[PDB]
Each structure stands twice: as C-alpha cells, then as structure tokens.
Design a protein around this motif. Structure first.
Motif, PDB file in Angstrom:
ATOM      1  N   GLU A 194      -2.360  17.213  41.356  1.00  0.00           N
ATOM      2  CA  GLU A 194      -1.688  15.993  41.712  1.00  0.00           C
ATOM      3  C   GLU A 194      -0.225  16.338  41.930  1.00  0.00           C
ATOM      4  O   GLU A 194       0.660  15.980  41.129  1.00  0.00           O
ATOM      5  CB  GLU A 194      -1.880  14.944  40.630  1.00  0.00           C
ATOM      6  CG  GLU A 194      -3.242  14.251  40.704  1.00  0.00           C
ATOM      7  CD  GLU A 194      -4.185  14.651  39.600  1.00  0.00           C
ATOM      8  OE1 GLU A 194      -3.691  15.155  38.559  1.00  0.00           O
ATOM      9  OE2 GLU A 194      -5.406  14.431  39.790  1.00  0.00           O
ATOM     10  N   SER A 231       7.591  14.475  32.471  1.00  0.00           N
ATOM     11  CA  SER A 231       7.362  13.676  31.288  1.00  0.00           C
ATOM     12  C   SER A 231       7.567  14.496  30.006  1.00  0.00           C
ATOM     13  O   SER A 231       7.168  15.650  29.909  1.00  0.00           O
ATOM     14  CB  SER A 231       5.970  13.063  31.327  1.00  0.00           C
ATOM     15  OG  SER A 231       5.027  13.931  30.746  1.00  0.00           O
ATOM     16  N   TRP A 236       9.022   9.098  31.055  1.00  0.00           N
ATOM     17  CA  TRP A 236       8.842   9.546  32.401  1.00  0.00           C
ATOM     18  C   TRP A 236      10.225   9.576  33.006  1.00  0.00           C
ATOM     19  O   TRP A 236      10.971   8.602  32.863  1.00  0.00           O
ATOM     20  CB  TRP A 236       7.944   8.567  33.146  1.00  0.00           C
ATOM     21  CG  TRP A 236       7.897   8.820  34.602  1.00  0.00           C
ATOM     22  CD1 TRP A 236       8.543   8.110  35.585  1.00  0.00           C
ATOM     23  CD2 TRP A 236       7.208   9.897  35.262  1.00  0.00           C
ATOM     24  NE1 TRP A 236       8.277   8.667  36.812  1.00  0.00           N
ATOM     25  CE2 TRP A 236       7.459   9.761  36.645  1.00  0.00           C
ATOM     26  CE3 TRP A 236       6.391  10.961  34.816  1.00  0.00           C
ATOM     27  CZ2 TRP A 236       6.932  10.638  37.582  1.00  0.00           C
ATOM     28  CZ3 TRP A 236       5.865  11.835  35.755  1.00  0.00           C
ATOM     29  CH2 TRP A 236       6.135  11.658  37.119  1.00  0.00           C
ATOM     30  N   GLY A 265      -1.582  14.582  45.421  1.00  0.00           N
ATOM     31  CA  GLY A 265      -2.298  13.563  44.679  1.00  0.00           C
ATOM     32  C   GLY A 265      -2.599  12.209  45.350  1.00  0.00           C
ATOM     33  O   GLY A 265      -3.054  11.283  44.661  1.00  0.00           O
ATOM     34  N   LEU A 282      -2.204   8.948  42.911  1.00  0.00           N
ATOM     35  CA  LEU A 282      -2.723   9.113  41.548  1.00  0.00           C
ATOM     36  C   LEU A 282      -1.984  10.234  40.869  1.00  0.00           C
ATOM     37  O   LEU A 282      -1.946  11.341  41.364  1.00  0.00           O
ATOM     38  CB  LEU A 282      -4.212   9.447  41.542  1.00  0.00           C
ATOM     39  CG  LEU A 282      -4.784   9.646  40.129  1.00  0.00           C
ATOM     40  CD1 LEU A 282      -5.185   8.315  39.477  1.00  0.00           C
ATOM     41  CD2 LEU A 282      -5.955  10.620  40.192  1.00  0.00           C
ATOM     42  N   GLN A 283      -1.414   9.946  39.710  1.00  0.00           N
ATOM     43  CA  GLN A 283      -0.571  10.895  38.997  1.00  0.00           C
ATOM     44  C   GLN A 283      -0.942  10.922  37.545  1.00  0.00           C
ATOM     45  O   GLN A 283      -1.118   9.870  36.952  1.00  0.00           O
ATOM     46  CB  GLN A 283       0.889  10.467  39.032  1.00  0.00           C
ATOM     47  CG  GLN A 283       1.293   9.502  40.118  1.00  0.00           C
ATOM     48  CD  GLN A 283       2.734   9.730  40.499  1.00  0.00           C
ATOM     49  OE1 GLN A 283       3.642   9.048  40.039  1.00  0.00           O
ATOM     50  NE2 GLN A 283       2.949  10.752  41.316  1.00  0.00           N
ATOM     51  N   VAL A 284      -1.036  12.116  36.992  1.00  0.00           N
ATOM     52  CA  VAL A 284      -1.117  12.312  35.547  1.00  0.00           C
ATOM     53  C   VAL A 284       0.317  12.574  35.069  1.00  0.00           C
ATOM     54  O   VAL A 284       0.986  13.428  35.602  1.00  0.00           O
ATOM     55  CB  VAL A 284      -2.028  13.504  35.162  1.00  0.00           C
ATOM     56  CG1 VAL A 284      -2.106  13.666  33.655  1.00  0.00           C
ATOM     57  CG2 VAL A 284      -3.434  13.284  35.680  1.00  0.00           C
ATOM     58  N   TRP A 285       0.805  11.858  34.076  1.00  0.00           N
ATOM     59  CA  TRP A 285       2.115  12.197  33.574  1.00  0.00           C
ATOM     60  C   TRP A 285       2.101  12.970  32.299  1.00  0.00           C
ATOM     61  O   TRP A 285       2.756  13.971  32.180  1.00  0.00           O
ATOM     62  CB  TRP A 285       2.896  10.949  33.272  1.00  0.00           C
ATOM     63  CG  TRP A 285       3.199  10.181  34.395  1.00  0.00           C
ATOM     64  CD1 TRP A 285       3.200  10.557  35.697  1.00  0.00           C
ATOM     65  CD2 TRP A 285       3.615   8.845  34.348  1.00  0.00           C
ATOM     66  NE1 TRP A 285       3.589   9.511  36.487  1.00  0.00           N
ATOM     67  CE2 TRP A 285       3.859   8.440  35.671  1.00  0.00           C
ATOM     68  CE3 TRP A 285       3.829   7.934  33.302  1.00  0.00           C
ATOM     69  CZ2 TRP A 285       4.300   7.151  35.971  1.00  0.00           C
ATOM     70  CZ3 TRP A 285       4.246   6.701  33.602  1.00  0.00           C
ATOM     71  CH2 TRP A 285       4.482   6.301  34.934  1.00  0.00           C
TER      72      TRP A 285
END
Lengths: 151, 148
Positions: A18, A51, A60, B17, B113-116
């Motif tokens: 991503e 993050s 974030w 993403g 769509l992002q995972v942080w």
C-alpha cells in the motif's frame, strides 16, 4: 540538503505494498520526492505518511507535497503539517509542540514511510481519477552517507 | 438482515494502494482483513480526495481491528477531513462541506486503502504496518443485493 542531489548520491527507497517505501537506513532530516508528471497533468499533491506510538497513544503524521510539473520535492522531516491522534476510530488534531517534536524525532529514525498521491487534475483543471494515473513515476530518496558528510 | 456472499463486488487493487471498482462505491464499503499470526492490532483507512468550488480536500474513514474480520464502513461518517492549502492542512468541521464531500465520495469508483499502524501481541510495533496483515480486501454489495 534541499537542493536535489546528483544520481550517485541518491539512496532510493524501495516501493512495496500500500505504497510503502523502505530504506536501508534511517530516513534522517530530508527526503526527496521525484515526480514525473503525465503530459496532461496540471497539478498533483499527496504526502509521505508515518505512524508512531508514544506512551500508549497512536499518531498519524503527514508531510504534504505538491507540484504542477515533473520535479524533485525536498521534504523537511522537521516540518510535518498534519498530526492526528488516532483514538479508536476517531481522530484529534495534535497542536502540542512537545508531542510534535517527539514524533518527528522518532520519524527521523524510521526506515519506511507511506507514499500517497491524493489529488490530481489535468491542464483544464478537471480531476484525474485515480490521482495515481496522473504521474508516470514517483520515487523517493534520501541522501547518501557521503552526501550527509558534506555536513 | 446480514449478510453476503457471492454478491460481494470486490474492487481491484492498484499500486499506491488504490482499490478500484466497476461501479460507484455507494453508502457502504467492507474492509475484509486477515491478520498475520503475531499481530494484535491494526488500523488504517480508506481515503478519498475531492474538489469543491475549487478547493481540495482529503477525507479519511478509519478502521481498526484486533483480529480477522470485515469492518463495515459508513461512507456518511468520515472522521478526518482536511482542506489541503498548498503544503498545509486545515481541519473541516462545516457540516455542509462534509455533506457535499460525502455525497461526492459515494459516487467514486476508487479509494485509497492504507494500513497505518500495527502491533505485535506484546504491543511491540510491527514495521512496516502493512506486514502485519496476511490479506486485506474491500468489497461493496452487488447491485442485485443493493436492490434488496
């Protein structure tokens, strides 16, 4: 380091998932976003995103870039522009300059970042969906150990 | 009246993403997550950018999970709305602006769509966050299903 570097001084990050970009060493004080815009692109923006956690709280942090042309954008990792605490599925602006500085201290030690393209529009000002299709390539580098030695 | 299946219109995953669909997203999107085995927690978002009266906005719906799940996301209830002004940002609380934005978003065919963030079962950060998942998809409902 805010002038773009010569080719042999660019340590490129490797692009993953991503839009993760991963480096072989800590990011440090400066990153550079290299953008080759599509020929009908009038404008684009997006961020490098991080993050972090500090004492049980999650954050974030985003550094925003923009361009109207193919160019290399210098991102100062001391100057984030969007900081938010993620509290469950809610967020809350952070304004506390002590928390912000701690987050940036920590981000300077990270070996990866998120690269996102947010918004793009063409030469008539009309949106390009997805924003991504508006560029031909986007890459991110940091300076080599050797470039940093030059103070 | 839950639920599913086979009338789940999944979106194709792109590069940065992006995830894109063959029809407007609509009111609900479902983030389908499979957690990796030493993972205790993940969050991130679905994000969108919109323009309105020549201003640019970034809008984010945050999900989180502590396990393998499907998070229903309410397209009317975003939680991070910033106007992007040059290289700075400015939080949006105007209810009409939000309303216009969500209206536009619901007609989009693609999303970011992002995972942080992600943490180990000992609360030990996983890096990159992305690595903490075995699998993340999004679907929306089939138009057959939507008619119901």
């Amino acid at each position: 380091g805010l002038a773009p570097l010569a080719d042999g001084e660019k340590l490129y990050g490797k692009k993953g998932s991503e839009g993760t970009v991963t480096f072989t060493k800590a990011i440090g004080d400066n990153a550079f976003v290299e953008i080759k815009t599509g020929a009908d692109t009038g404008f684009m923006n997006g961020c490098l995103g991080f993050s972090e956690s500090i004492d049980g709280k999650n954050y974030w942090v985003a550094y925003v870039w923009q361009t109207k042309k193919s160019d290399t954008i210098s991102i100062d990792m001391s100057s984030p522009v969007q900081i938010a605490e993620i509290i469950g599925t809610e967020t809350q602006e952070v304004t506390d300059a002590d928390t912000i500085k701690k987050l940036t201290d920590k981000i300077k030690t990270e070996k990866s970042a998120l690269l996102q393209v947010w918004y793009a529009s063409d030469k008539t000002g009309k949106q390009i969906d997805p924003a991504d299709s508006a560029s031909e390539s986007i890459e991110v580098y940091i300076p080599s150990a050797s470039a940093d030695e030059a103070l």
